Write an enzyme that holds these catalytic residues in place. Structure first.
Site: not given
Length: 162
Positions: A11, A20, A117, A132
């Protein structure tokens, strides 16, 4: 390595309001403020989050305070979600961090939608789950980060972060 260091790597840290990867107003360690295009709206969210009239700028201490809250919120989000809690429970501690990472980034509802998933992860079919997971808007929009998280799910090691 731990979930806090992992997310600090993914981050980053910025003390002033910024946008972002999706163009949304954010501050600190990936703390999403709002999806509104209004900076004023973002600043109001910030004042409320911190508990003071800010100038769109916070201290490092305040950034780490929101971060602690946010990591706790991601875990709480997993544990109260009927699809995510069983997967989390089935996982080892390293892969648990990878699932918290996903929820930190895109929220409980977002991750809970990864039905196929999640099933593969619970079945511990790691290479298949990895393939996946990459078949996703998530992977396509943030491929380097998604690769790091997926490598963590595939190997159950911190190799992608060291």
């Amino acid at each position: 390595m731990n979930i806090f260091e992992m997310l600090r790597i993914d981050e980053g840290l910025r003390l002033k309001i910024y946008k972002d990867t999706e163009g949304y107003y954010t501050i600190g360690i990936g703390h999403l403020l709002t999806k509104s295009p209004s900076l004023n709206a973002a600043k109001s969210e910030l004042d409320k989050a911190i508990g003071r009239n800010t100038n769109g700028v916070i201290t490092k201490d305040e950034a780490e305070k929101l971060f602690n809250q946010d990591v706790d919120a991601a875990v709480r989000g997993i544990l109260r979600n009927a699809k995510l809690k069983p997967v989390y429970d089935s996982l080892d501690a390293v892969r648990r961090a990878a699932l918290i990472n996903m929820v930190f980034q895109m929220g409980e509802t977002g991750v809970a939608g990864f039905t196929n998933s999640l099933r593969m992860l619970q079945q511990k079919r790691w290479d298949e789950a990895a393939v996946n997971l990459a078949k996703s808007r998530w992977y396509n929009q943030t491929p380097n980060r998604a690769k790091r998280v997926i490598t963590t799910f595939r190997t159950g090691t911190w190799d992608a972060y060291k």
